[model samples]
Target: KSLVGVIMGSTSDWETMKYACDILDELNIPYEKKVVSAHRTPDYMFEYAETARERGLKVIIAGAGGAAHLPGMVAAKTNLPVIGVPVQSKALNGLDSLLSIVQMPGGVPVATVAIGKAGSTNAGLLAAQILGSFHDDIHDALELRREAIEKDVREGSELV
Candidate 1:
């Protein structure tokens, strides 16, 4: 049971969602990936949300293209923090996905990110931050990771 879970609406989202996984890997966070669509698999989405706490999942990062309801739906079902990534869509240029994710009703809040790969990576980092709030181990790990990131930037800035 991983502490962080990354759920995508479809395999097509892999290109974007992979960045989320990559960021989590870089931070040394244990994360599990899944393909669960809110539109296609509502039951599975609900079930996953309900069982997430029991499975030791602290946070969920959900990525979806058009009609991005996975993050909102999961937030409605669980008290855990959910980060939403709006993948680029064919129709509407992912505006539909972004709107779907960001316009959640009251009492259900999904931390929405930008569109595409940058959004995916930020979602992963946001999940880590959420988990780190409660767990000291994760908090320390994340702090170290932040320091390393800062060091890398400072060191590489000279070359650039």
Candidate 2:
């Protein structure tokens, strides 16, 4: 069963959202990834968000470019914790995307990260950090992940 739901406006976002999925993979967490558009297909997005909790999703990570309304819309439809990653598109880069995500109604608590790869990678870790607070094993996994990175940094410093 998937725990986290990773969605984007289209397959075009997969190149960037892949890092988010990679982190979830590294964390040993199961997730279901899909392309759910808030514009082209409104009903699908609504149904997906509405049925998320019932499908066993604990957190949802949505990546959209050029003013994505999906994140806030999905957050509005569901109570699950949501993480929004703004991708860059030719139309307006990320300005509108940055604005749309947090323009949520009634403080839906959508956590918005950076607008690029930084956000993609952290989206997974942030979700892990949230879950880690409640699960001991995941907390240890996160710690181990950090230690491994610190180990790399420590070794890399010798080359520099």
Candidate 3:
């Protein structure tokens, strides 16, 4: 009953990608994660995306650093929505990753998020939000989380 597929280009991406998974776990969103590198394992990546719909995956979250291609390539092979997370790199601070993801040409779309941890975190939230739009339970769960965060923000603001 997994609705989301979280794939990364390398194990190194797990550090940032974990944030996405953590949010999914918190919301009880059933998902699967794997290292499906676009460069290193093109055939596997293609196969994963081609069969994603039949396998019950509604959304795909793909993460990669420098020259990030996992997201777009997966999107190219599948009709399912793909969310891209740009992992921070040592040289450009992930500017390269961000450009590689967000600059996708017309007719192919990857819902690209920010760089590094924040991007990964929002990718999870965005996936949840997409599911929430159709599922009442997910929507309610997201609302509750949002309310809790708003409360925390208000309380913290009083200190400033």
Candidate 4:
């Protein structure tokens, strides 16, 4: 069953959000991606968060660019943990998106990540980390990846 729900504002977001999904793939983490806009599709966004827990979703990685409201809205609707990714924008250079997502209210928390591809990938790693804490099977795989990456760092092929 899928444990992570990776949602975004539009299909265009895949350019950045894919990094998150790719990491999930490497970890063999079962996750599903979808397009859920808080502004364009209000009802669906609310419905998604409403039914996420019942659907076996334990964590949510939501990415949004301009005027990002998707992550916050989803967090507000569901009790599940939500990670907000601020996809880079055109004019404001993603500052607005970053501010909108990070400036979330209390209780209905959205753990905000950085802007652009770096943030997206971190969201995935963060998702895996969250899952690995309880899912023993997945934990082992993540540990292996962590060890392998450390070796790579030692070999100068990668920076740990």
- On TM-score, the candidate that comes out on top is 3
Q: How does residue 80 of candidate 4 score in lDDT?
A: 94
Residues 81-155, model 4: lDDT tens digits: 999999999999899899999999778899999999999999999998888889888888888988998998888
Model 3 pairs in collision: none
Candidate 3 residue-pair clash tally: 0
For model 2, how does the per-residue alpha-carbon lDDT over 12-81 read when each residue is reduced to its tens digit? 8999899999999988999999999999889999999999999999999999888688888899889999
Steric collisions counted per model: 0, 0, 0, 0
Per-residue accuracy of model 3 over 16-74 as CA lDDT, tens digit each? 99999999999999999999999999999999999999999999999998998999999
Question: Once model 2 is optimally superposed onto the true structure by TM-score, how far is the C-alpha of residue 85 displaced, in angstroms?
Answer: 0.5
What are the TM-scores, per candidate, against the unseen true structure?
0.89, 0.93, 0.97, 0.93
Residue 67's lDDT within candidate 3 is 92
Backbone clashes in model 2, listed as residue pairs: none
lDDT of each: 0.90, 0.90, 0.95, 0.93
Consecutive 10-residue window with the lowest summed lDDT within model 4? 151-160
Give lDDT: candidate 4, residue 135.
83
**Top lDDT hit:** 3
